[PDB]
């Protein structure tokens, strides 16, 4: 959840098929552009 | 011709350039050419409003750079300011061709930034990095350290110009996605030299340009645990106002795993004045490798050196990717074709690839000084008997051919002839491999049947050090030992820009590359009937391996069924092409990328037009 996420990242381990996968991230990037 | 102040005459009036890269003065792979020599034209069009912003090292400041002062007062304000603040700014020139304006940034001195600014990412784009990668980290340290040179440039100027800046690689994406996080007044560029899952999908995973539609892009980069690097590089990828690749090959690649068409495509270049510094060359070149040849087949010298030809492969030791496997095959394909048909003509192919040796074998060497030691003998014996003859025939009488060699001239040649004596056969490799038994071109050669037989038709030659001009056995640098050469053989299955093929054709040489490359997709692009121009493309991507092979091996029987007049038309041809990758042309796309960025990001007082019109029409 948000922090744990974050720390997930830090530590290697990425949800890059749920929620920490491209998707979300491009949908956040699409604001500032 | 088509110089740069041809038809994109455009108003660029206060507009200061910034060519982000994390590889200016500190050399490390391939775009560190591509900047040096691009900086010349770069700053013929902008002037002195064009600065390379790149990390600091003490190796590349103390060899290549010049520390001068900010020639601005908001230059000097931003350095002072950032340097108060808790950094380490450099500024300098670049001691290059063009002299352009450097900023220096060392990363290592905003350690202490790293956990507050690796959290700030995250709040912006969700974006996490591992702590133990040790060069993505160095990554986030540079691009916010860009971007915080950014902002307080455009804070510290009296008048503020429009700003474009240009990132070169994921290493420095982060700073173009800051720069649109922070909704700065810049206008964005981004160019791709390589994708970074395509180097990683071509060695393992099968099929990798007949696939490009079913890999799952997540998957892989996950797995193979690069997802942070990915991402950084897909980001910066998406949130650019231009974005571009350095070929179309590269440009299919990056529309199905980066999930964006290029804006543009723009070739890599280069300066071929000095290149031109083309058959006397030639001809040296090519004495110098026939008597390297007599030197290395010594005793065994049955076989026409008038009507025999040199091939060579140049590059990496990558078996597979720079497609050494197909060359070897179609090799031994052309040998048994060479001698079914009887011909009189030979093939000595050299495979110029680094691996791991210690030195020298003693078989090259002894073959080496037995030819030394036969070229002395016979110039002393030429020498003594030039004498003789022209003294008798000073007095009027034709020379008694039985009595000009005498006791000591006949010892210095039973000398000679003693010393060529052998029953081996000449090796494949002039050193002594560290992997020998696990050394893939060995155990193709092995397989394949290529033992420098006198029957063979083929010979081969693997040299593994890099050519120099001081080595004992090729006292010769690389561009002169190739510019001997009959044809180059590149078939290459993975490369985005070959710069080995192309700096081959610039020196007039023949050469054969695939559709799989980008010099080979420019080449097919912008030529029509290469092959009149000596430029073969081998057509690797619509073909399996063995029809790749079986036209490789049509290709070089055709090449060796030419006559001297066909070659020597051919070699012409080649050498009046060295025009078509110079700056002074492909520099004009970086110029388009470069307004079209401008227009997008302020179109307000800029407005592009889009005019792609940028050639050989002969025979077909």
């Known amino acids: 959840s948000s922090e744990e996420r974050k720390e997930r990242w830090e530590q290697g381990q990425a949800d890059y098929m749920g929620a920490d996968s491209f998707d979300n991230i491009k949908r956040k990037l699409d604001t500032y552009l | ?620």
């Open chain 2, 1 to 620: 011709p088509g110089l740069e102040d041809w038809e994109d005459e455009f108003d660029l009036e206060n507009a200061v350039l910034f060519e982000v890269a994390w590889e200016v003065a500190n050399k490390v792979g391939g775009i560190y050419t591509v900047l040096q020599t691009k900086a010349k034209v770069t700053g013929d069009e902008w002037g002195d409003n064009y600065f390379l912003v790149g990390p600091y090292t003490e190796q590349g400041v103390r060899t290549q750079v010049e520390l001068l002062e900010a020639p601005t007062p908001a230059l000097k304000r931003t350095l002072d300011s950032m340097n108060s603040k808790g950094c380490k700014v450099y500024f300098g020139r670049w001691l290059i061709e063009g002299g352009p304006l450097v900023v220096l940034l060392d990363v290592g001195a905003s350690a202490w930034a790293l956990e507050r600014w690796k959290g700030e990412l995250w709040d912006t784009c969700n974006i996490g990095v591992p702590w133990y990668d040790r060069e993505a980290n160095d990554a986030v340290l540079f691009g916010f350290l860009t971007t915080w040179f950014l902002g307080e440039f455009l804070a510290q100027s009296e008048e503020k110009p429009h700003v474009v800046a240009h990132f070169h690689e994921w290493l420095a994406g982060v700073g173009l996605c800051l720069c649109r996080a922070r909704r700065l007044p810049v206008a964005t560029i981004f160019t791709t030299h390589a994708t970074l899952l395509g180097r990683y999908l071509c060695a393992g995973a099968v099929d990798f340009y007949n696939n490009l539609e079913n890999f799952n892009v997540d998957k892989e980069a996950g797995e193979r645990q690069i997802y942070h690097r990915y991402c950084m590089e897909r980001a910066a990828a998406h949130c650019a106002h231009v974005f571009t690749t350095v070929s179309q090959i590269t440009a299919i690649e990056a529309q199905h795993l980066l999930k964006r068409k290029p804006d543009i495509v723009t070739p890599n270049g280069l300066n071929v004045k000095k290149f031109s510094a083309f058959q006397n060359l030639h001809a040296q070149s090519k004495a110098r490798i026939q008597e390297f040849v007599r030197g290395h087949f010594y005793g065994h010298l049955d076989f026409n050196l008038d009507k025999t030809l040199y091939f060579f492969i140049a590059g990496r030791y990558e078996f597979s990717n720079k497609g050494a496997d197909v060359f070897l095959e179609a090799l031994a394909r052309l040998n048994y074709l060479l001698r079914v048909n009887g011909s009189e003509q030979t093939v000595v192919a050299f495979f110029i690839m680094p691996a791991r040796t210690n030195n020298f074998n003693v078989e090259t060497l002894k073959g080496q000084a037995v030819r030394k030691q036969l070229w002395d003998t016979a110039n002393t014996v030429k020498e003594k008997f030039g004498r003789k003859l022209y003294e008798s025939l000073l007095v009027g009488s034709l020379p008694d051919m039985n009595k000009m060699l005498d006791k000591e001239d006949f010892t210095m040649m039973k000398r000679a002839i003693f010393a060529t004596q052998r029953q081996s056969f000449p090796p494949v490799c002039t050193h002594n491999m560290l992997d020998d038994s696990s050394d893939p071109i060995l155990t193709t050669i092995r397989r394949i049947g290529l033992f420098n037989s006198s029957a063979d038709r083929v010979k081969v030659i693997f040299h593994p050090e890099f050519l120099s001009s001081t080595s004992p056995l090729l006292p010769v640098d690389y561009e002169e030992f190739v510019r001997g050469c009959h044809l180059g053989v590149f078939p290459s299955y993975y490369e985005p820009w070959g710069y080995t093929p192309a700096e081959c054709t610039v020196m007039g040489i023949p050469s054969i590359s695939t559709n799989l490359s980008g010099f080979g997709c420019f080449m097919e692009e912008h030529i029509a009937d290469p092959s009149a121009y000596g430029i073969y493309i081998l057509d690797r991507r619509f073909r399996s391996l063995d029809d790749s092979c079986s036209q490789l091996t049509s290709f070089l029987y055709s090449f060796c069924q030419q006559s001297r007049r066909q070659r020597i038309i051919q070699r012409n041809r080649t050498e009046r092409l060295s025009d078509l990758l110079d700056w002074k042309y492909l520099g004009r796309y970086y110029m388009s990328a470069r307004h079209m960025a401008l227009s997008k990001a302020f179109p307000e007082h800029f407005t592009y037009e889009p005019n792609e019109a940028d050639p050989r029409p002969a025979s077909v």
